Design a binder for these strands. Structure first.
Ligand code: K
Ligand code: K
Ligand code: K
Ligand code: K
Ligand code: K
Ligand code: K
Lengths: 263, 264
RNA sequence: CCGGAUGGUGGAAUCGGUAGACACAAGGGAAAUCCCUCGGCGUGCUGUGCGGGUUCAAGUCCCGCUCC
């Protein structure tokens, strides 16, 4: 018998060279497979809903695999976790049909960017938040961002190493708010082009610091040029908070956080 | 030569340090902090913290002071020192204070926050900054079973052996337990605390929360004046020295105590 | 006149904080993905035209020299 299982993985990529399995470096996927394999007692290969670059964290990542071995729930949750490193962890298990597929079944991914806005660098979670010196204007930022909403040509916020096809994406919602000293950027789209978020954030920050007009983000978008927008934003601050899947699969959706961040 | 009494608001992540207490043998927050301060003042510097934390415990409201004959502009102590500090340690603010100031002795009351990730499966993000407690906690029940420690009591049951205070008596300003999504936070403020006082109150408070003991237990323990009766000391990675109290005359800056996104 | 002269190329570095972010190449190993290297030395040092200086700290300031 083949069993298609879906796991909700969570992690802290600060100590990993990303998710993708590199035969020469540390990858969340690798550590995750080693464990799953020990439980199923057979070589296991997983498929994630969205690979994160080296540095980016995850709290809503979703993966699936097929094992011939039958393990009770705890085996996949409490079990795998017992084999996983402290930074990586399983949030929930759920057997799914054959028509499910972490990546291809995903209707839209969602990210959150954590910006610690203070003159002096942070200490706690120094690898989990991006530190931005210049005073940000959450208000102004949010406004200068609604122009990216909908379907547009994110070429200006694209990448040259983008292995995807058409640079067109559909943004469900992009909001920027401030939590005390923090500034958070929540963005949801059907998908994103290489470094799309870290780029939108980069240019959004310049605006926030009043180094550019609100109209700049819009001018960039239509500029269809990358060498016009700000430089890619730091990684340590990006969190893959949540992925969208058809309600028919009935996958559990726990708080996306990160941490104390309201859902 | 002029002597300058300076007060720094230090913040850090003790996950990688054997505590604050400078030890000529291991990594201590205080040591790394002094090395830096010294490079700035270009003279051996010795600091005094408002409350030493044990190996593991973090800090976001810690306050220290020192005296240097060297005159450095503000940035030198803030942006400067930080530039010499490790990434986990950091200065939050500088402030020259009078001679009658003293981080420890001037402190009117310290304050802590305990972060409990209440979920069957262990956390990944901040795995060293939050305490993972398997059994389902009852924030409500916990808070209630705690108000009995409020005020001045004999915290012998929540004390320790390696304790140096000549008296295990303390005055609790307030102890509250709330739940943030999967988290359970315990905020406690007192004039001072006896060795492992907080981690102990939390330990026994958790047993109650998990319904392994009655709300009346915390109270029975307190009056029991016995330690071998209460729960075992709670984990360290979850304790944060969020804030210290000082006379308003000193006018020290009081930024958000957090940790992180935690409302002030 | 004043503002610049930093990597192979752009292009950064909080009204002195401890280089080269970021982007785009190149080269090598495991059409493209990916690791590491890509100032000079080598057997970590000195290096932000060039020596000298001040400062705990200099690309970041004071002085003499070359060119926009
Ligand atoms: K630094
Ligand atoms: K430098
Ligand atoms: K530098
Ligand atoms: K010098
Ligand atoms: K120079
Ligand atoms: K000069």
């Amino acid at each position: 018998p083949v069993y298609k299982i879906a796991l909700g993985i969570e992690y802290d990529g600060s100590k990993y060279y990303g998710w993708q399995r590199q035969n020469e470096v540390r990858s969340v996927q690798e550590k995750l497979e080693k464990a799953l394999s020990q439980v199923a007692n057979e070589p296991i290969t997983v498929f994630c809903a969205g690979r994160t670059d080296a540095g980016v964290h995850g709290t809503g990542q979703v993966v699936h695999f097929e094992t011939t071995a039958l393990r009770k729930d705890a085996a996949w949750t409490l079990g795998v976790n017992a084999n996983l490193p402290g930074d990586i962890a399983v949030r929930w298990v759920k057997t799914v049909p054959d028509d499910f597929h972490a990546r291809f079944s995903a209707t839209a991914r969602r990210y959150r960017y954590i910006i610690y806005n203070h003159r002096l660098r942070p200490a706690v979670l120094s690898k989990g938040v991006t530190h931005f010196y210049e005073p940000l204007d959450a208000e102004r930022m949010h406004r200068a961002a609604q122009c990216l909403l909908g379907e547009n040509d994110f070429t200006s916020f694209r990448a040259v190493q983008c292995q995807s096809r058409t640079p067109w994406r559909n943004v469900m919602h992009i909001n920027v708010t401030r939590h005390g000293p923090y500034v958070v950027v929540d963005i949801k789209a059907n998908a994103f082009v290489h470094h799309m978020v870290r780029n939108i954030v980069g240019s959004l920050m310049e605006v926030g610091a009043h180094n550019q007009p609100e109209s700049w983000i819009a001018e960039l978008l239509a500029a269809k040029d990358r060498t016009l927008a700000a430089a890619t934003a730091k990684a340590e601050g990006l969190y893959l908070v949540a992925v969208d899947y058809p309600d028919r699969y009935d996958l559990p959706k726990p708080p996306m956080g990160p941490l104390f961040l309201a859902d």
